[PDB]
């Protein structure tokens, strides 16, 4: 009848002698018919749930899915995609059911009555983002995504309680080996869920620094790491504290900040070698000592580029093993696109260098190739907490640069042709016309205003053309041989309007546009950087400890491994593991 | 000893800031300008990476013949740094603004920049690019970087003012 | 009640005694010192929160006393406690 007040007073009063099977079939109709408020009543008076969740009744529960769903047919199709191969027709299976049929308040309750609060809140967020992509219609996907945010609320809220309780014991909440999903991790669960709100909280972010400084006491200063990177004797000293002297060696050189700093030092030396080749070791002779060392260095840069390619969820699953997904997800990162453009026009710049005719084109491509390898210096330092959130900002600013560059370029055509038309040069070649139209007005924005080349009253020699009219010689090299002095009151006026529009109206309105969109995107791009951060922590944790030039040692060790034939999870005993879940199920109950 | 004392004047004069932070009118604003250093250091990072990128690519494209390491590290860093402040030496980087185009027995075409530390003669192979690569520099540094630093100052001035 | 982190007891014992402004500042003095002398940081969150509650009442009660008499509340600070 869907009347709750009857069902309480029947069960709270009236010769209370309810047996097992009186409550058993009562909860079935509480579940088959949606009715979640009756479900909380029966569990409050207690059911078995080990004699209730017999697998006939679960298949009975899935049989009452609606026919025109994205689930019933999805079962009949199977009669995230691995869930279909896993689900067929005491609380975790019941929580799984209410997520599948988008039963919102049932799933919000079944999460509350089970173990594994944080992992199933992240697990519920993992399903409902995956299963919305597997959903044909977008009407119910709005409810599917809204109820994913409600589990995003409770996972962030319950972990923030557990983190402020014990930062050590809630650190173990993430890196617990969760036996669901084939030995998953709650940070890995939060990565695959695209749980931006879960990474943004200060407990996970402080946990990421401790994973970043892996076994090196993450409150350690930066200069002591620099002092211990360039003195590996100083690793065993009164500076940097940690939590057999050979593991003590490997906790330093295996830690992600030192793998990072190894990758930074070895890349600043790549760009220092690149420049010393490009500036002083690049004669048209065949390649010498340091230029061949640069070519091997960038081969390793390419061998380290395929490691991410053939070693690479809001997409496919882990271990796809077909390369039309692994290389397609490789050539979708905006950095790889920068990493491959750099390595392909290094290859062009060297192929054109070694051939005798194309030498100056090979140098020219390598000078632009230095430009692209140096900009890859930005992608490296976005893992930094101080720099990183601001590197991610400066790409949000491009929508305003492109407005400025539109508005300026239209005004630069308008000013530039009108000035080049009014003063008529006699050296009007198309490279020089397109220079006094575009390049010379562009430089007036930066205080390069050639008055002597545009204003006739500042130039002498006023008889320089046999054409009719009055002329005058500008002393500039690309200013024309002689320009007209017909309406040079206007050209001087038209410069004044240019410096007002470009140098004052356009430049200071771009600052207003930067200051506005910096205010908008500061919250959202920091929230995006927090979630991006763990993707970059374990991208160095999985990378070999040896950097780019010496990486060929760790590629002749990996390839010799195959002829002889980062998944982060801290290990602990099962009794210390159940003490964790007992501690954490108390703090769920103390929170609800 | 003179050189150390000239830098010593610099440090005693900056101690003039610590004295006037007791002032109600000046003082709350002296304490601000150290909160701005986290954005200067981003700017100084982003500029310095772009200054290496611009500076070596320009010094590589136009190849000077006076390529000493003090002068190479000057046309790579110092001369591009000054272009942010309106010191743009067109006559030293743009060959179409310099005459005397036969100044090297090396193969290729060359040209003499009139600057003192601009090299004896630079190359004119791809000087359409150097001129283009200056245009991209003044866009990134002088417009993208400088005006985004104002947006960063205006934001963190709003946070840290209270 | 400050020593044993009894929050509502200290909030009441402040109200029943003399020296309102100096013991509100005095309570803020202890609970910031004694949080540094505390080994565990769980109860130090309660130790620092109850220090802000005395920071609330000292600011609120002095702002009343200052708007009453700026001369006679000037003597509140520079009293030889
Ligand atoms: C082209 C030039 C710069 C050649 C490189 C010379 C190197 C021998 C040395 C000189 C000082 C070194 C730097 C000293 C300070 C550090 C901070 C370090 O930052 C971190 O790894 C930790 C910050 C974080 O937590 O993300 C990165 C390496 C770096 C820049 C070092 C990189 C290599 C440097 C530039
Ligand atoms: C009309 C003329 C000026 C030619 C137009 C050239 C520009 C449209 C392009 C060429 C080089 C570009 C710059 C090259 C270096 C980058 C770094 C980039 O930052 C990142 O890549 C961070 C990585 C990330 O956030 O994902 C932001 C844009 C920027 C400044 C680009 C801004 C736009 C530029 C100037
Ligand atoms: C930034 C937005 C608002 C648009 C600005 C575009 C210009 C700054 C660009 C596009 C066309 C470019 C030019 C095309 C023609 C020339 C003449 C050229 O002079 C020569 O004759 C040398 C060899 C040659 O290219 O013929 C030197 C480069 C230059 C200025 C190029 C560099 C800079 C220019 C003017
Ligand atoms: C290197 C030169 C400046 C030699 C110094 C010449 C002095 C004989 C005189 C000329 C005018 C004087 C100034 C006149 C105004 C005052 C305001 C005064 O500010 C306060 O003390 C009160 C403000 C507050 O409440 O904090 C500080 C000293 C000052 C700068 C005086 C400092 C010494 C000065 C510069
Ligand atoms: C790469 C090249 C440019 C060398 C890098 C030099 C800068 C990193 C340093 C050298 C001198 C520094 C400045 C010296 C004077 C100070 C005053 C200082 O203000 C205070 O000290 C107020 C006191 C306080 O608030 O506690 C703020 C930083 C600032 C501008 C410093 C800004 C950063 C500077 C330019
Ligand atoms: C502000 C951030 C973005 C980085 C900018 C760094 C440069 C502005 C600095 C670092 C290296 C410095 C230079 C190192 C080498 C030289 C050549 C030197 O010329 C000489 O040969 C005189 C004596 C000598 O040093 O050999 C004069 C100083 C100068 C330009 C130095 C002053 C300015 C430089 C270029
Ligand atoms: Ca890459």
UniProtKB/Swiss-Prot annotation, chain B:
Q: Where are the transmembrane segments?
A: 1-20, 41-61, 130-150
Expression sites (tissue/organ): Widely expressed with a high expression in intestine and prostate. In brain, it is both expressed in whole cerebral arteries and isolated vascular smooth muscle cells. Prominently expressed in Purkinje fibers. Expressed at higher levels in T-helper 2 (Th2) cells as compared to T-helper 1 (Th1) cells. Expressed in keratocytes.
Q: What result follows from mutating residue 159 to A?
A: Becomes insensitive to decavanadate's voltage modulation effect
Name which cysteines form disulfide bonds: 103-121
Q: Extracellular side: which ranges?
A: 62-73, 95-129
Side Cytoplasmic, residues = 21-40
Location of motif Selectivity filter in this chain is 85-87
Superkingdom is: Eukaryota
- Describe the function of this protein: Calcium-activated selective cation channel that mediates membrane depolarization. While it is activated by increase in intracellular Ca(2+), it is impermeable to it. Mediates transport of monovalent cations (Na(+) > K(+) > Cs(+) > Li(+)), leading to depolarize the membrane. It thereby plays a central role in cadiomyocytes, neurons from entorhinal cortex, dorsal root and vomeronasal neurons, endocrine pancreas cells, kidney epithelial cells, cochlea hair cells etc.
Q: Please give the record's comment on domains.
A: TRPM4, is a temperature-sensitive ion channel, it adopts distinct conformations at different temperatures, markedly influencing where and how ligands interact with it. Decavanadate (a positive modulator), ATP (an inhibitor) and Ca(2+) bind to different locations of TRPM4 at physiological temperatures or at lower temperatures.
Q: How does it assemble?
A: Homotetramer.
Please state the pathology the record ties to this protein: Progressive familial heart block 1B: A cardiac bundle branch disorder characterized by progressive alteration of cardiac conduction through the His-Purkinje system, with a pattern of a right bundle-branch block and/or left anterior hemiblock occurring individually or together. It leads to complete atrio-ventricular block causing syncope and sudden death. Erythrokeratodermia variabilis et progressiva 6: A form of erythrokeratodermia variabilis et progressiva, a genodermatosis characterized by the coexistence of two independent skin lesions: transient erythema and hyperkeratosis that is usually localized but occasionally occurs in its generalized form. Clinical presentation varies significantly within a family and from one family to another. Palmoplantar keratoderma is present in around 50% of cases. EKVP6 inheritance is autosomal dominant.
Annotated protein name in UniProt: Transient receptor potential cation channel subfamily M member 4
What lineage does the source organism belong to? Eukaryota, Metazoa, Chordata, Craniata, Vertebrata
């Amino acid at each position: 009848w869907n009347r709750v007040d009857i069902a309480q007073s029947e069960l709270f009063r009236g010769d209370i002698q309810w047996r097992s099977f009186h409550l058993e079939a009562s909860l079935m109709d509480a579940l088959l018919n949606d009715r979640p408020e009756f479900v909380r009543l029966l569990i409050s008076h207690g059911l078995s749930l080990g004699h209730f969740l017999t697998p006939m009744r679960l298949a009975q529960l899935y049989s009452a899915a609606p026919s025109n769903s994205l689930i019933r047919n999805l079962l009949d199709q199977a009669s995230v995609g691995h869930v279909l191969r896993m689900l067929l027709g005491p609380w975790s299976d019941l929580l799984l059911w209410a997520l599948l049929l988008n039963r919102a308040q049932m799933a919000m309750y079944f999460w509350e009555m089970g173990s594994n609060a944080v992992s199933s809140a992240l697990g519920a967020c993992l399903l409902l983002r995956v299963m919305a992509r597997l959903e044909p219609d977008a009407e119910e996907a709005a409810r599917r995504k809204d109820l994913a945010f409600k589990f995003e609320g409770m996972g962030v809220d319950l972990f923030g309680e557990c983190y402020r309780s014990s930062e050590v014991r809630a650190a173990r909440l993430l890196l617990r080996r969760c036996p669901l999903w084939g030995d998953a991790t709650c940070l890995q669960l939060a990565m695959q869920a695209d749980a931006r709100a879960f990474f943004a909280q200060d407990g996970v972010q402080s946990l990421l620094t401790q994973k970043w400084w892996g076994d090196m006491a993450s409150t350690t200063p930066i200069w002591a790491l620099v002092l211990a990177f360039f003195c590996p004797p100083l690793i065993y000293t009164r500076l940097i504290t940690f939590r057999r002297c050979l593991r003590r060696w490997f906790h330093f050189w295996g830690a992600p900040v030192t793998i990072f700093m190894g990758n930074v030092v070895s890349y600043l030396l790549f760009l220092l070698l690149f420049s010393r080749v490009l500036l002083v070791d690049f004669q048209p002779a065949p390649p010498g000592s340091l230029e061949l060392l640069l070519y091997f260095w960038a081969f390793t840069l390419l061998c380290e580029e395929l490691r991410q390619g053939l070693s690479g969820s809001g997409g496919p699953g882990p271990g796809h093993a077909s390369l039309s997904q692994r290389l397609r997800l490789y050539l979708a990162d905006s950095w790889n696109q920068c990493d491959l453009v750099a390595l392909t026009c290094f290859l062009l710049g060297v192929g054109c260098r070694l051939t005798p005719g194309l030498y100056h084109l090979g140098r020219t491509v390598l000078c632009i190739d230095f430009m692209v390898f140096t900009v890859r210096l930005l992608h490296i330092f976005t893992v930094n907490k101080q720099l990183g959130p601001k590197i991610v900002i400066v790409s949000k600013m491009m929508k305003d640069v492109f407005f400025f560059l539109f508005f300026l370029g239209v005004w630069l055509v308008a000013y530039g042709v009108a000035t080049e038309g009014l003063l008529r040069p006699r050296d009007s070649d198309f490279p020089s016309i397109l220079r006094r139209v575009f390049y010379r007005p562009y430089l007036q924005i930066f205080g390069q205003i050639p008055q002597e080349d545009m204003d006739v009253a500042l130039m002498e020699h006023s008889n320089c053309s046999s054409e009719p009219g009055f002329w005058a010689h500008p002393p500039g090299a690309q200013a024309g041989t002689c320009v007209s002095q017909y309406a040079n009151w206007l050209v001087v006026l038209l410069l004044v309007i240019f410096l007002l529009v470009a140098n004052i109206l356009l430049v200071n309105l771009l600052i207003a546009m930067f200051s506005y969109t910096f205010g908008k995107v500061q919250g959202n791009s920091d929230l995006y950087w927090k979630a991006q951060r763990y993707r970059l922590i374990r991208e160095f944790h999985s990378r070999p400890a040896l950097a780019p030039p010496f990486i060929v040692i760790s590629h002749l060790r990996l390839l010799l491994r195959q002829l002889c034939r980062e998944h982060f999870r801290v290990y602990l005993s099962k009794e210390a593991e159940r003490k964790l879940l007992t501690w954490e199920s108390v703090h769920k109950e103390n929170f609800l």
